[PDB]
């Protein structure tokens, strides 16, 4: 079971190893385009935090999930920021969500006072008054219910079937990583021109000891040229100091 459009869940993925092979191995995965990265390079980088959003929308509105899109579901239900990093996966799920007798447990906004900024939180289902007169109590004239239920039946043609959607969002290499890729470590070498790969950083140089004190929330050092020159070893937490050959 996936949540409604208007109650998309946000799951925690951290302190584990993520293998995207099984993710990309599913046959019916069709609308799979990634913005900040390339889909075949997800297995070699470490992400600081990963989030997954699940909701089921109609087929005619799957195109509204792209960043910057305008419409009626991307203004009152779920909006993506213009600087989105990550990507979305969509696939048809007419097999399960639709029912012979009619499944009516999926809802979505129809009216709202104003649009919503990216991800800003809300659920309230109070009545909405069209007229200038204040309306309360129950439904009637110029004050309605802001919810409508999807009708998912096999008789509907293409463009009305339920479409399960999942969205993955993540930052990139600015914090102590927790979600990584499947890779094998090795033994650190001191004072020798090597080709290090420290949690995503590829470079060349010799690694020494450093005395500079890193606060618990810092992992990288920088200089005026704004290039990394001091990194903290994941496994054992002493501070190194990168200098070229």
């Amino acid at each position, epitope marked *: 079971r996936f949540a409604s459009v208007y109650a998309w869940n946000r799951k925690r993925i951290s302190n584990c190893v993520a293998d995207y092979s099984v993710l990309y191995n599913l046959a019916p995965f069709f609308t799979f385009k990634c913005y900040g990265v390339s889909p075949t390079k997800l297995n070699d980088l470490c992400f600081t935090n990963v989030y997954a959003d699940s909701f089921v929308i109609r087929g005619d509105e799957v195109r509204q999930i792209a960043p910057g899109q305008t419409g009626n579901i991307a203004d009152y239900n779920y909006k993506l920021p213009d600087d989105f990093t990550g990507c979305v996966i969509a696939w048809n799920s007419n097999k399960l969500d639709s029912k012979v007798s009619g499944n009516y447990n999926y809802l979505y906004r*129809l*009216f709202r006072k104003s649009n919503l900024k990216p991800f800003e939180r809300d659920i309230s289902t109070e009545i909405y008054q*069209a*007229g*200038n007169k204040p309306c309360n109590g129950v439904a*009637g*004239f110029n004050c*309605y219910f802001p919810l*409508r239920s999807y009708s998912f039946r096999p008789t509907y043609g293409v463009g009305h079937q339920p479409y399960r959607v999942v969205v993955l969002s993540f930052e990139l290499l600015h914090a102590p990583a927790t979600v990584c890729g499947p890779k094998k470590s090795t033994n650190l070498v001191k004072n020798k021109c090597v080709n290090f790969n420290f949690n995503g950083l590829k470079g060349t140089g010799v690694l020494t000891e450093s005395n500079k004190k890193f606060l618990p929330f810092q992992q990288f050092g920088r200089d005026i040229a704004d290039t990394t020159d001091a990194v903290r070893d994941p496994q054992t937490l002493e501070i190194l100091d990168i200098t070229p050959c």
Partner: antibody
Amino acid sequence: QMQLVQSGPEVKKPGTSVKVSCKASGFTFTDVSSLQWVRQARGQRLEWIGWTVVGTGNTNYAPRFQERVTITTDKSTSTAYMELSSLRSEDTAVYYCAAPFCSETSCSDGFDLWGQGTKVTVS
Amino acid sequence: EIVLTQSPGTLSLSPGDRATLSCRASQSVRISYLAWYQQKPGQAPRLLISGSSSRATGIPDRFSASGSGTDFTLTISRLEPEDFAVYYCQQYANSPWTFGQGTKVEV
């Protein structure tokens, strides 16, 4: 301009059914706008039949019209249909469709716009 | 379940005079869901005032609404000879809507 249009008067026979439409180019059905239907006989008091919501699709019928009338709204074609069955001589009257000028969230408590009405007569 | 009675039944006053009409019901009290209409022979009814507090488009200041209780009232300052018609009171709040019987004014 902002005015509704409707079909012409019609003559039918007993044991038949009709469909009455209020598709008007002078008004935009949008999503908050709603319209009611009224009937005027020869020198009789006006009677309310029903009104429906374009957005949520909810209806509201008279306590005595749950057996021979159906009201539906199509936003794509911007029209409202009534299927009327069992048309006797008491149903021969002029129909009118009314809807306020309600665009987006701004509209008043009165049905300013008014259709000219169609005279349905059955012999 | 609401029945509206409009009074007085008939009128015959000189043009340009001041007149006032009322309508009555038996259900709960509401003032903002009431509308007044005029219907002419061969023409669709037209709206005059809605909610007893606001005017419609193109409605001159002649029609003035009043009344705070269950009663509803309308007042016309001058009877210009084209206003001879029938008035209708309509409510919205309660169970399915129903109009009044109508008040006809004569010359």
